[PDB]
Amino acid sequence: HSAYTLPDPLVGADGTRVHDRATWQHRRRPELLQLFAREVYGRTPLGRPEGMVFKVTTMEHAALGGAATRKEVTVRFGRDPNAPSMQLLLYVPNAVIARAERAPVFLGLNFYGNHTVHTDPAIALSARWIPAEAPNGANHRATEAARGSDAQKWPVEQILARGYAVATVYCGDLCPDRPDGLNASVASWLDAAAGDQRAPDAWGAIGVWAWGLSRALDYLETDPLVDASRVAVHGHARLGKAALWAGAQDDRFALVISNESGCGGAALSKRIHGETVARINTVFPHWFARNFRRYDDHEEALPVDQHELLALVAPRPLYVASAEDDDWADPRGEFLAVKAAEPVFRLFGQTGPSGEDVPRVNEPSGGALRYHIRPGPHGMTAQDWAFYLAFADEWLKSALPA
Ligand SMILES: O=C(O)[C@H]1O[C@H](O)[C@H](O)[C@@H](O)[C@@H]1O
Ligand SMILES: [Mg+2]
Numbered sequence: 001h002s003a004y005t006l007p008d009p010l011v012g013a014d015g016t017r018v019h020d021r022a023t024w025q026h027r028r029r030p031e032l033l034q035l036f037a038r039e040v041y042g043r044t045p046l047g048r049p050e051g052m053v054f055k056v057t058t059m060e061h062a063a064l065g066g067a068a069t070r071k072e073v074t075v076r077f078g079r080d081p082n083a084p085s086m087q088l089l090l091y092v093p094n095a096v097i098a099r100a101e102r103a104p105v106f107l108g109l110n111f112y113g114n115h116t117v118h119t120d121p122a123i124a125l126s127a128r129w130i131p132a133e134a135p136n137g138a139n140h141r142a143t144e145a146a147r148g149s150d151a152q153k154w155p156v157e158q159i160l161a162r163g164y165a166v167a168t169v170y171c172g173d174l175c176p177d178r179p180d181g182l183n184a185s186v187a188s189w190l191d192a193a194a195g196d197q198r199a200p201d202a203w204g205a206i207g208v209w210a211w212g213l214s215r216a217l218d219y220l221e222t223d224p225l226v227d228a229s230r231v232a233v234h235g236h237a238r239l240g241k242a243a244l245w246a247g248a249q250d251d252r253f254a255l256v257i258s259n260e261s262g263c264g265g266a267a268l269s270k271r272i273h274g275e276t277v278a279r280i281n282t283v284f285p286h287w288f289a290r291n292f293r294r295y296d297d298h299e300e301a302l303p304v305d306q307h308e309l310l311a312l313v314a315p316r317p318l319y320v321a322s323a324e325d326d327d328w329a330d331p332r333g334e335f336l337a338v339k340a341a342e343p344v345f346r347l348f349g350q351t352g353p354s355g356e357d358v359p360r361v362n363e364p365s366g367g368a369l370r371y372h373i374r375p376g377p378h379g380m381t382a383q384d385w386a387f388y389l390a391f392a393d394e395w396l397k398s399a400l401p402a
Pocket of ligand 1: 236237238239260261262263275280328378
């Protein structure tokens with residue numbers, strides 16, 4: 001039940017206790033980032049590549065019946081027109097634009113293509129490979145029947161009505177989610193040697209997806225319609241694992257949301273409940289670094305656990321959420337990771353969930369470090385988003401002079 005012991009985020013690798021925010025920021029945070037890079041996700045080999053190019057391919061000022069401006073942007077990772085790229089979809093609420101104010105942004109990757117997040121027939125159909133599990137796909141390619149096929153996870157009209165822009169990119173633009181996807185990924189292009197077997201500490205899909213989120217943020221910093229200092233990075237499940245790693249590595253993200261990210265996301269690995277290190281690496285060998293396989297059936301040897309990933313978001317707001325029936329993600333483990341990260345949030349004057357057991361369903365708990373568990377199976381629902389929008393309202397207010 002409790003057959004593990006966690007490393008203390010506030011004890012340095014040399015045993016010295018971290019007593020102050022400066023030691024956390026300038027020594028302990030780099031230590032932990034290097035541990036997760038080497039042992040779990042793999043190294044992010046560079047941040048912004050030189051020669052990133054942003055091309056707005058479509059712009060509609062009266063999308064969604066006039067409610068939004070919709071922009072599609074190709075973010076190309078080098079100057080040569082042949083360089084790899086990703087396709088960003090952005091809806092911005094026209095009520096905010098009309099007031100001549102920059103909108104805060106929710107940014108997250110999608111599972112099956114930009115055209116799946118909303119029925120809107122003007123969104124470009126992805127030309128990229130799509131998994132067999134994608135609704136209404138045909139031989140691994142998008143079809144018009146797939147439009148809006150993942151819209152329940154994306155309540156665009158509500159987010160816009162609440163004053164937030166919505167930005168998304170298909171994860172498969174960055175690394176196709178298939179065990180062979182790394183060879184057709186931006187990793188195959190970025191700081192790679194002669195294309196053979198990747199190195200032990202080389203990043204995999206989660207690292208690549210996370211890097212893509214930071215490149216989307218680079219684009220948002222240039223877009224006059226949005227406030228790139230108020231970007232909430234979010235993800236569901238495997239894309240929440242990526243949102244957490246993006247938010248931990250890139251402290252420009254103003255707020256981070258993990259929706260049911262489970263093993264190698266928010267859930268403690270040392271708890272051995274639901275999905276385990278061996279199970280995740282065996283089924284998804286491209287997700288983590290090869291070095292993470294050292295801990296298959298040996299989670300006791302992990303030098304970190306996921307509470308320390310959560311702690312890397314501090315002092316910025318972080319929301320971890322679970323589903324009651326989602327045993328595979330280990331909801332208790334996700335909550336206990338929040339509780340074990342809370343001392344770092346407290347060092348920074350924030351507060352986490354009250355209580356030392358999982359709260360009752362649909363009752364969020366915590367300040368800037370917040371948790372809820374909703375009824376039902378794994379997914380991302382309107383109820384999850386209602387809670388996330390309330391959190392963002394509290395923790396993403398436009399900055400005024402201090
Ligand atoms: O992406 C999802 O929904 C989930 O898919 C699989 O079940 C995987 O085992 C999980 O780690 C992941 O979170
Ligand atoms: Mg688990």
